[PDB]
Design a binder for this molecule. Sequence first.
Ligand code: CLA
Ligand code: CLA
Ligand code: CLA
Ligand code: SF4
Ligand code: SF4
Lengths: 37, 64, 124, 80, 144, 40, 165, 67
Amino acid sequence: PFVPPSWAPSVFVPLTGLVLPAIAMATLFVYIEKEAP
Amino acid sequence: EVGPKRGSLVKILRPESYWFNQVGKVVSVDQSGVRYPVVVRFENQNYAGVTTNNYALDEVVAAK
Amino acid sequence: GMLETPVTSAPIVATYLSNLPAYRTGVAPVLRGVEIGLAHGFLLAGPFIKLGPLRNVPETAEIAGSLSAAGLVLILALCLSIYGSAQFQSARDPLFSADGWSEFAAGFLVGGEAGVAWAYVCTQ
Amino acid sequence: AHIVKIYDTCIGCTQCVRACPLDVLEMVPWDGCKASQMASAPRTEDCVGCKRCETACPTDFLSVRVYLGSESTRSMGLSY
Amino acid sequence: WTVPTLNPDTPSPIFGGSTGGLLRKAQTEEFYVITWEAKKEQIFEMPTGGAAIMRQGPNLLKFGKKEQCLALTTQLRNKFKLTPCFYRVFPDGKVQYLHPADGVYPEKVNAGRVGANQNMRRIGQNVNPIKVKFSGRMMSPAEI
Amino acid sequence: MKDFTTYLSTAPVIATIWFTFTAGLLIEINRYFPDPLVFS
Amino acid sequence: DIAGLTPCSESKAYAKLEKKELKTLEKRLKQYEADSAPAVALKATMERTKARFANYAKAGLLCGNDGLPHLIADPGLALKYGHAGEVFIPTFGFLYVAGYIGYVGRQYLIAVKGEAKPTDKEIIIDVPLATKLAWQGAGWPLAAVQELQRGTLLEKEENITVSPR
Amino acid sequence: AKKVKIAVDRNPVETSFEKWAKPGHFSRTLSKGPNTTTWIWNLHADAHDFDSHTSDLEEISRKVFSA
Ligand code: CLA
Ligand code: CLA
Ligand code: CLA
Ligand code: SF4
Ligand code: SF4
């Protein structure tokens, strides 16, 4: 029941190494630059 | 008539002074009621190269 | 004032820059985005195809290189978009505004990907 | 903006005012010293924190003190 | 003594120009203007680099930050024995005058000045940092 | 001659003579008593 | 013996070490003449090598499995088994010289503090005074102790400057 | 049209060991003697900085030539 599929690394490695960092950097860059009301 | 005699040796009691617990020679004592009338000269300079400083009456005591 | 120099102040140089899409005012920001995106997108495919990890494969080299050029254009489009968000939060040219830059970034994505696709068609 | 404080051990030598490269300090009348003048810091918003004033003060310990604080275009000494 | 009014049409020294001049800050935040009278045409050193010739009579220069203006003021006073004064100019057109704030250079004591940031105690009589803790912000014992 | 002997009394000159003497004594002792490891 | 060590005179590895060093010297010797300058120098080295290994064995040192002398530092073990000359005796040899040097320097420093310009007496040494103090330092342990008992060795706490606390 | 010629001054300086016994003689600042160990380093650092000992170009040149 626990064993993940044999293709899990193919999806999660690019996802956590290329995709989430891109969204995280965009989120952080916008946040720090945001001006107070 | 106020302060130690000119040329006498006094011991400094200002904790923030470079010469705390050290002996210096009195150069002059102002009689105008200023905050720090006593002028003392030292034979060893401080970190800025100065060898003289002004002290209040209660910050200086006679040698011993 | 500033140190005058032919490079900084020359007639021939000034005219050339004034005709570039970036400096050509009077054009909608979206259209300027497409014009700029196409030029960079077309060039971006070159180095990936010739020097990529799959460069020596006969037919896969063209596809892999162009597909990586398309990816880089997508990343650049994100950079353009977030730059507008940070820079323009509150003047003569419409481009340098929150509304203008958002259109500019969208045009770059459309033009850039079209240029990458157009470059691929040239090969095959 | 930095914080600059003048303490009552000032002897009114004026060396801090001359040393300051941004005209932050000035001399004002006083009755607490022989020179009858004291240093003042009316324009600390222009202070950059060089501490040239502290280098120039003869009194021991210093009579002028600079406490580096919040940064800004002026205090960070930027021309851009 | 009254606050001088800046004259934007004042002639400027004979200077070729350099890359050490004003930047985009002058157009968005502020810049500084220094003016003085010259007895005779002479060569002086620009704080931004290079040499300039001052015209006889009024002269005017623009600098990017205050320290540059007061650096030139020191040179003019010490060597040429002149009496320059400089302003702060904002992009909106407002002009603020300073140095000399009251017309007399700060090194010389003048009546009418009000002491600022003067503590009537020694450095050694400040309170301990614990006694100024949780005061809403990082505060030194010297501030209180 | 008084000034010259004063020059020889300066710190660098004294140290050179003193260490030259000190080194020479140690070198000579090890020349006549080679390889000392234990007082014995 | 002590700590599992054995006397170097009875150590097999110690004896083998001497042969190795002499063999190395002999190998270089046979490429020269009988009484040439290089040959004489090499023979002199071999004599010192043989003397050194005899002296250490004669001194009754202890050798480990490495076949090299080891020294005993505990005073009780040293005096118990006659190893006082390794560390114990040299300990009091050094302290006498170290105290001699330090005591002589302290005497000179006190002597010039009374002069008008002490600083000029430090860069420019007063050689006649220094030689006088150099000889009188031989009795420093006696003089040092008497100062301690009379209470003039240390300054008063009230005459020493300290930082705010 | 200044002619090219040999030009010297006779006995400009006296040969004595007096100044060998007065460290720092070359500089006004160090001539007073030491008060802190910083003086010792300043003596060696500024020994050959002729241009700062005197403002006379002729005196500087003569030291360079003999050094
Ligand atoms: C975990 C992080 C990570 C991952 C997963 C990758 C993955 C990859 N890297 Mg590496 N790289 C990384 C971090 C990473 N890198 C970092 C941190 C650096 C800097 C030190 C580099 C520097 C680097 C270089 C310099 C190169 C690579 C290359 C590669 C490729 C090698 C395999 C190959 O033959 O691809 C072949 C690739 C393809 C056949 C195409 C794959 C898909 C493309 C790239 C994107 C497609 C996008 C799609 C069309 C539209 C968007 C979809 C999206 C929204 C879901 C592969 C795509 C090589 C390459 O070929 O890059 C292009 C290459 O030259 N990387
Ligand atoms: C600067 C150093 C350098 C260089 C020249 C290269 C070069 C290369 N690397 Mg390597 N690499 C480097 C450092 C470098 N690498 C480092 C430090 C690492 C460790 C992190 C790696 C890790 C790495 C990996 C993992 C891989 C490579 C690969 C490659 C190849 C393809 C790269 C690619 O797709 O670029 C794409 C190129 C561009 C998008 C453009 C490049 C810049 C252009 C040409 C500038 C042109 C400017 C122009 C002249 C200006 C004109 C102005 C005018 C109009 C006014 C290529 C041979 C890949 C391969 O397969 O190699 C065989 C691969 O898989 N590299
Ligand atoms: C640096 C600390 C230190 C240490 C760890 C040791 C350790 C040792 N010493 Mg040594 N010793 C030292 C310093 C030290 N000593 C000093 C400074 C002196 C005075 C100069 C001595 C004088 C001395 C003597 C006279 C003797 C030892 C002995 C010993 C051994 C057993 C007793 C002992 O001292 O127990 C642990 C150590 C301590 C708690 C510190 C104080 C030790 C005192 C000074 C000596 C105790 C001797 C003991 C009563 C002997 C009883 C008979 C024994 C066979 C059981 C042990 C290897 C004995 C020995 O040779 O055993 C084989 C022995 O007879 N030591
Ligand atoms: S703060 Fe120091 S330098 Fe300034 S006037 Fe007072 S004593 Fe003089
Ligand atoms: S720190 Fe610098 S700018 Fe500030 S008052 Fe002191 S000298 Fe002037």
